[PDB]
Amino acid sequence: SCIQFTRHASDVLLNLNRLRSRDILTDVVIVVSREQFRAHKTVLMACSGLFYSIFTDQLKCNLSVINLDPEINPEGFCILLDFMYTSRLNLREGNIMAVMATAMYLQMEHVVDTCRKFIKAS
Amino acid sequence: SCIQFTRHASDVLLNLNRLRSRDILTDVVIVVSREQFRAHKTVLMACSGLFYSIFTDQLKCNLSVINLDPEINPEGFCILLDFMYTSRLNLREGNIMAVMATAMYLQMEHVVDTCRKFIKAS
């Protein structure tokens, strides 16, 4: 009966990334050390178990700044945030361990698994 | 050298709809005369030129309740909101004209284009 649009989800995601880039309706700043990352809570909750728990916690849900562990690699976090909004995970010899560890912290187990397959590749 | 996750956009979209279903971080009620639909502004702005204009307008950006034209068919809107959050457009002979007219009003020409292909095959 029904019609399914195969590019719809990727087009929504493209436009969400364009909203992030223009800073339109971004409602949280994630802080890693002194580095600040602007985002939409809902996109974060849709990609990460950590962010889900944080923004359904009544003590934290209304905060505009969330501070993650300052021991987290900011390049690792930046790679993963770009990934949430793009589907593209840019992995390098030099950044891969940091990304894997950051993905564990964010409870994005499937990204970890993809990093493990990547390591098995070479 | 990038890895691209081909199911990522649709998995994000599934989770956004689960968030809509559980009423989590919904920040707007769209009103069609007296019918009500809870949504996330950013999904609406990612899908429709009309909603983009509404939520970037300084008079309306901080409203928790938004009126659409109260004469639009509420079934037509409801089919389209579900489409925004699912990729699935459920077209029957009984609703096609209401969906098409509503899509024009939401500035979703590619959906209108599809309803025209549906008219051409039916």
């Binding site: 029904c2 195969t6 | 990612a46 020409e109 284009d113």
Partner: peptide, 13 residues
């Protein structure tokens, strides 16, 4: 279930 690959016409500025 029929599929279409049509691209979304709306692009955020």
């Amino acid at each position: 279930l029929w599929y279409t690959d049509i691209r979304m016409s709306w692009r955020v500025p």
